[PDB]
Enzyme design. Sequence first.
Site, PDB file in Angstrom:
ATOM      1  N   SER A  16       0.799  -1.219   0.000  1.00 34.96           N
ATOM      2  CA  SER A  16       0.000   0.000   0.000  1.00 34.96           C
ATOM      3  C   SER A  16       0.835   1.273   0.000  1.00 34.96           C
ATOM      4  O   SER A  16       0.379   2.298  -0.520  1.00 34.96           O
ATOM      5  CB  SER A  16      -0.929   0.018   1.217  1.00 34.96           C
ATOM      6  OG  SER A  16      -0.196  -0.208   2.408  1.00 34.96           O
ATOM      7  N   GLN A  17       2.036   1.246   0.577  1.00 35.47           N
ATOM      8  CA  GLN A  17       2.848   2.457   0.611  1.00 35.47           C
ATOM      9  C   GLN A  17       3.503   2.727  -0.739  1.00 35.47           C
ATOM     10  O   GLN A  17       3.623   3.887  -1.151  1.00 35.47           O
ATOM     11  CB  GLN A  17       3.916   2.355   1.704  1.00 35.47           C
ATOM     12  CG  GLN A  17       4.419   3.712   2.199  1.00 35.47           C
ATOM     13  CD  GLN A  17       5.570   3.602   3.189  1.00 35.47           C
ATOM     14  OE1 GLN A  17       5.450   4.012   4.345  1.00 35.47           O
ATOM     15  NE2 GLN A  17       6.697   3.060   2.733  1.00 35.47           N
ATOM     16  N   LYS A  18       3.919   1.675  -1.447  1.00 34.12           N
ATOM     17  CA  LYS A  18       4.684   1.834  -2.674  1.00 34.12           C
ATOM     18  C   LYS A  18       4.173   0.892  -3.750  1.00 34.12           C
ATOM     19  O   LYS A  18       3.712  -0.216  -3.466  1.00 34.12           O
ATOM     20  CB  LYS A  18       6.182   1.571  -2.438  1.00 34.12           C
ATOM     21  CG  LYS A  18       6.790   2.470  -1.374  1.00 34.12           C
ATOM     22  CD  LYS A  18       8.164   2.984  -1.773  1.00 34.12           C
ATOM     23  CE  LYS A  18       9.260   2.309  -0.977  1.00 34.12           C
ATOM     24  NZ  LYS A  18       9.096   2.524   0.490  1.00 34.12           N
ATOM     25  N   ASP A  83      16.304  -4.850  -3.554  1.00 35.66           N
ATOM     26  CA  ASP A  83      16.314  -6.253  -3.941  1.00 35.66           C
ATOM     27  C   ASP A  83      14.887  -6.722  -4.186  1.00 35.66           C
ATOM     28  O   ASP A  83      13.962  -6.339  -3.467  1.00 35.66           O
ATOM     29  CB  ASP A  83      16.958  -7.114  -2.852  1.00 35.66           C
ATOM     30  CG  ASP A  83      18.469  -6.981  -2.809  1.00 35.66           C
ATOM     31  OD1 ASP A  83      19.069  -6.539  -3.811  1.00 35.66           O
ATOM     32  OD2 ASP A  83      19.060  -7.338  -1.768  1.00 35.66           O
ATOM     33  N   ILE A  85      12.189  -9.669  -4.117  1.00 31.54           N
ATOM     34  CA  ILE A  85      11.914 -10.901  -3.385  1.00 31.54           C
ATOM     35  C   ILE A  85      10.774 -11.609  -4.106  1.00 31.54           C
ATOM     36  O   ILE A  85       9.616 -11.184  -4.016  1.00 31.54           O
ATOM     37  CB  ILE A  85      11.549 -10.619  -1.921  1.00 31.54           C
ATOM     38  CG1 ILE A  85      12.556  -9.655  -1.287  1.00 31.54           C
ATOM     39  CG2 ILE A  85      11.481 -11.913  -1.127  1.00 31.54           C
ATOM     40  CD1 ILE A  85      13.982 -10.174  -1.259  1.00 31.54           C
ATOM     41  N   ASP A  90       3.682 -10.440   2.364  1.00 28.29           N
ATOM     42  CA  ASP A  90       3.730  -9.257   3.212  1.00 28.29           C
ATOM     43  C   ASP A  90       3.213  -9.624   4.597  1.00 28.29           C
ATOM     44  O   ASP A  90       2.153 -10.246   4.725  1.00 28.29           O
ATOM     45  CB  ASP A  90       2.894  -8.135   2.604  1.00 28.29           C
ATOM     46  CG  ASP A  90       3.065  -6.830   3.328  1.00 28.29           C
ATOM     47  OD1 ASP A  90       3.314  -6.845   4.551  1.00 28.29           O
ATOM     48  OD2 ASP A  90       2.946  -5.782   2.668  1.00 28.29           O
ATOM     49  N   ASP A 131       7.898   1.935  12.237  1.00 28.01           N
ATOM     50  CA  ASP A 131       7.171   1.269  11.158  1.00 28.01           C
ATOM     51  C   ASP A 131       7.852  -0.048  10.791  1.00 28.01           C
ATOM     52  O   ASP A 131       8.188  -0.308   9.631  1.00 28.01           O
ATOM     53  CB  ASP A 131       7.039   2.187   9.941  1.00 28.01           C
ATOM     54  CG  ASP A 131       6.400   3.530  10.287  1.00 28.01           C
ATOM     55  OD1 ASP A 131       5.598   3.588  11.240  1.00 28.01           O
ATOM     56  OD2 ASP A 131       6.700   4.529   9.601  1.00 28.01           O
ATOM     57  N   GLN A 133       8.246  -3.862   9.880  1.00 22.62           N
ATOM     58  CA  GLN A 133       7.402  -4.550   8.908  1.00 22.62           C
ATOM     59  C   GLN A 133       8.292  -5.437   8.058  1.00 22.62           C
ATOM     60  O   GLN A 133       9.470  -5.127   7.853  1.00 22.62           O
ATOM     61  CB  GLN A 133       6.642  -3.519   8.066  1.00 22.62           C
ATOM     62  CG  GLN A 133       5.922  -3.999   6.831  1.00 22.62           C
ATOM     63  CD  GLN A 133       5.288  -2.826   6.108  1.00 22.62           C
ATOM     64  OE1 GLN A 133       5.883  -1.753   6.025  1.00 22.62           O
ATOM     65  NE2 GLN A 133       4.069  -3.010   5.615  1.00 22.62           N
TER      66      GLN A 133
END
Length: 176
Positions: A16-18, A83, A85, A90, A131, A133
Amino acid sequence: AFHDVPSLGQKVGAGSQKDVFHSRQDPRQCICLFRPGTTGSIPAEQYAQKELETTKQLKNLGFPVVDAHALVKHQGSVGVAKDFIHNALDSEDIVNNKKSLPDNLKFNKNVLEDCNAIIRRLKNLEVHIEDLQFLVDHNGHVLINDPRDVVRSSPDKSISKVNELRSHALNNLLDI
């Protein structure tokens, strides 16, 4: 400091952030660009710069991280080259029960061990990760992703975040 990526590869993932794109410069990397309204009031260029620094500090300190290589920009979009993955889970999807860890035994063992190892460092060094995560790669290894800051302080909030994910691995391993 911010490098121009002229062209982007195919889009991959669902964070959601990126928004994340395969790198056309290096298939081991991906281009991760901030979505609108995800950096609050802080300018996106600062947020990206702080993530690269924190990722490198944690890497130096021994933590397992999704490595960050360069500050990048594409048109008006700003972010970090990282990198890639493959088939990453998530950890927010896992703890919010939108997705689930596979049954595989070796997979869940890796999640358990790596969660334990991350907690040990947090205790030994007495740091808190803003944050905090993770991404879980296809073998079950846990990698810290998009850290915002690391500061010497009580690690209890961070240790709880890890335990949150570890619990799902414990629950699976206790099922024979």
